[PDB]
Subunit: 317 residues, 4 copies
């Protein structure tokens, strides 16, 4: 039987005997993602070029407005906003949402794949809503995932029931369920990181990557891929297996990627798919944040690959 | 004034006092590219999944093949998808030879990586009965070439003698809008692009050049690395941002990996028309005289100062 | 604040403390309607004409399959099917749906507006579901409405809370709420019927139309409009006011339109909009059907216009 | 073999050994029509209703056609239903063609989602004078091309030229007009009549008598069916596809009719005649009227020839 994201979300909410608030949140996010996709694919660009005589900001506006009007949220943290956004009293629900509305858009001028990343938390205290409600470890996530605006548009949604992938059919604006309860390969054959900054690598990263290129045994060297857009690289890791790295170094002891709306959602998807996600020192999902924009190192993907990295990392610890 | 690809192609044909045959070819190709984009973005996939109770690379080849055949402008067609050249039936023959990759990068379409269509257009040069040999011309001889990138948005890059022009597909109206005119690549970039998984097989010249990008001998900032693994995506980035793209020979691909006729030559033509460079290491890509329609070539291309720097390192290793 | 069909249907179900079954029904119908619209606008027609080297049937298949897979229905009545469809036991819910999947499609060859009409009943009994469960008067409707595939695509949905109109934004495949709690004009200035049957008209119809052309109170004559597609003509009646008539004639002595999936849903929309719908002898919604494809005469629209027709009708007994 | 509007127009221009100017005109119009279709179907309406936290369609449509035709470099004089005076194209963009068009016909009733359309007629400038409004004052029989786009259940472009009438369906998945009906001809006699019978009290006696013959046939035949969408493009297209007759005649209150000669009557009359149909004012062929004002009105009775001819017999019977 055919299944849509709308039908899937609703049925999961009915199974859980929810009140319907999270379902409305998720319906609203889905509508925003379709609107971002339409804009990313440049529908209407002819009018900008005068036929009748901003993208990251627009994407942030779509998600903010759709989530606010769901009546399901109370605190919203965006890559694009300096402070947490507090929902007006009359529209407050119980959920906290952290999101990157257009990840990878810094290089959107070359039409590289971009994406939307989100993580949904339940507000934990009855206090007046504030940034502190967003300072939860990723292990508290209720749902998380991403939309990839690639060759096609796909929404990957992870919850307690596992990871499910929905393809956007732009003819009818419906996300069609195409991959159910997806699991990552135990060991991959691809490594992904920016090797241009090798002179800054921690010695452990240098040694691990050298082992991927010059394997000590009779195995084939891994292939390399680095799109430079986190959603594209993490999605490829999910589909094909392997390892994605944005690790710490001495000039960046906490990494570069942001914990709340990049690392934690992707770490959550990975673990629900049977993968792993580490800072080197601990699981990404166990980090307790103190700053809504704080950075975290991240190494994620197939467990045998992540564990091999940790073996090398501890050798230099 | 707004300009569409349709209007742009027609006016170039008018200025050249052509008979309209090449205009019909390019209009047919534009229609095929829009149909491929729609399919690549999965329009109608719900029907495939049972909403009412071909492979993408094969469909794309069928779209390009049929639109070019029915243009009456072509006589010989070479596709990545076909072992032998397709010879157009006599009554539909025109004078052009088209080599193309209808869905470049589609081997990894399962992870929704950017894919593209690459094409190069030659005039038939021989007066013989049309055959596979008519596609064996050096890239030197191209009349027009370019690619469609099905990335975050769909763009067509078209190169001819008048230069390189970039058109964005507006999917609301199915129209290619001219958005970047007479494009030129940066003289020198800050990004290098290659699969470093083959580091163990690199010739010394490639190894040293990449070492220079990571550890600059002059203490400037290291280049950033990018490698999508889809040639159209990596080359388009090289065009837009500058830098260098490399697919050199390795042990699995001793003649290189990329295909000369419908990957290297079109991209090399776009690059040179944009003020860039494209070399095999030994010679300009466009000077290679092919002997086989699916033959491979090593390729190093992008900003002129970056390729020239590579070539100096190459000469240092004889 | 923006509102979608998805969000509106979900919120009405929450206010009603429903189990979510009707919501799944309506979302499934929403998906089918977008797919029908896509096909009606001829998306993909180039593939039929050889670019790479039935509509009424497809429309029925879309509605049938989406409703079956909702797990919300037990009996399905379509204009396209001789007998009622009984849903298999594992997919049964409690709702009975009568629909015309592509109303007006007989003239789709001239690109006239066409539509989808639907009416939803609740099955209350523990008997095994059968065709007889669809033999209900329209006053039993839980929800009803129509999708119009006209110059744009609009879904009109009627329930106890009133009538609401949703515009399909095809860039994102989302129905946008654009007209809330719609009420029809008390009196219009347009009458709609096929005057080609003037020779067969009952004396009451003839006299009523004479009053529209030569007004007894010295008012200006009504304008005439007859698209010949029931959904187009009735939607215009809703938006602009006035009257729509399909009375008995010699080829159709019980009228021509179908009671179950044409007259009843439109009569329901009209009454929920403050309008009226009569057979001449009684309200459409009070007719007790004996055959799922039985026909009925219908006069519907603005209340003053229908009441005026009924005055003429009562004059002729 | 599949054929698109772009390819068909280009090949017709090649067959005629044209310079390509008319081809550029038509490509530009095709682009405008796709943009109108997109807006008519309400793409992006979610943004107007606040999804991220403005012109009426008839104005946008006029702006689209005006700008696309200007930038074709193929036109010199433009007449629109929306503009009191003809637009004279600035010198650097001038071509030889005169275009009269209605950018969104029937749009006054667009609020009920009734079918709407675009109508156009293309002339060559005949005078050696500086271009002016007078260059649009040509009889319809001078038309080089004419036709219409109907934004109905699907969007179709009907294009008439000397080679006949051809119908192209817009495939919105790819923005291509697909040739679906070639060298169209209308039925010799139909079974539908189309006019606003609510104003029967104002009818001319000939019209009254003719419509009476359709409802109460004297020859024991079946009465005609009635259809009246109230959008000219929709009613005329149905007349082309199914046959029959469409009427907006002159009456006692409107001695010149209501529809506009230059950009409503002439193009539809031209399409009709190229399809083997007829189009008359009652007194003469629409295509023979020589206009004196670009917004002048004309009565129109058009469609299947046996029906128009029957109408004219009744009309002449009443002198
Ligand atoms: C395990 C999953 C996340 C449960 C789901 S899945 C969905 N659509 N809704 C819920 C849910 C539970 C409670 C509530 P609520 O009372 O806050 O709405 O919703
Ligand atoms: C420099 C460019 C390639 C010239 C162009 S650009 C276009 N649309 N057509 C032509 C062209 C020249 C000759 C012919 P033809 O007589 O084969 O048709 O066409
Ligand atoms: C008055 C309106 C129609 C009530 C609505 S509105 C909506 N979306 N659902 C319902 C509803 C009631 C009962 C059930 P259920 O337990 O069969 O699902 O649903
Ligand atoms: C009979 C038809 C109208 C001929 C056609 S059909 C088309 N696409 N162009 C032309 C045409 C003739 C002259 C010119 P021009 O030199 O003004 O461009 O064009």
């Amino acid at each position: 039987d055919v299944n849509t994201l709308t039908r899937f979300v609703m049925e999961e909410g009915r199974k859980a005997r929810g009140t319907g608030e999270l379902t409305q949140l998720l319906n609203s996010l889905c509508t925003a993602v379709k609107a971002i996709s339409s804009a990313v694919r440049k529908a209407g660009i002819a009018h900008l070029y005068g036929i009748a005589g901003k993208l990251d900001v627009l994407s942030n506006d779509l998600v903010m407005n759709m989530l606010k009007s769901s009546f399901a949220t109370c605190v919203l943290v965006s890559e694009e906003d300096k402070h947490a956004i507090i929902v007006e009293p009359e529209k407050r629900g119980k959920y906290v949402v952290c999101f990157d509305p257009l990840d990878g858009s810094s290089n959107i001028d070359c039409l590289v794949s971009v994406g939307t990343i989100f993580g949904i938390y339940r507000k934990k205290s009855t206090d007046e809503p504030s940034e502190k409600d967003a300072l939860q470890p990723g292990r508290n996530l209720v749902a998380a995932g991403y939309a990839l605006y690639g060759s096609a548009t796909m929404l990957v949604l992870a919850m307690d029931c596992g990871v499910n992938c929905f393809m956007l059919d732009p003819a009818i604006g419906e996300f069609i369920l195409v991959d159910k309860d997806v699991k990552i390969k135990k060991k991959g054959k691809i490594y992904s990181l920016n090797e241009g900054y090798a002179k800054d690598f921690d010695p452990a990263v240098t040694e691990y990557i050298q082992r991927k290129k010059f394997p000590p045994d009779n195995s084939a060297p891994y292939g390399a891929r680095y799109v430079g857009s986190m959603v594209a690289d993490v999605h490829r890791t999910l589909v094909y297996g392997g390892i994605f790295l944005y690790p710490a170094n001495k000039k960046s002891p906490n990494g570069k990627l942001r914990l709340l709306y990049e690392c934690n959602p992707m770490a959550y998807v990975m673990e629900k798919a049977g993968g792993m996600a580490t800072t080197g020192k601990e699981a990404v999902l166990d980090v307790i944040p103190t700053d809504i924009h704080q950075r975290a190192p991240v190494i994620l993907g197939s467990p045998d690959d992540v564990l091999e990295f940790l073996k090398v990392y501890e050798k230099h610890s």
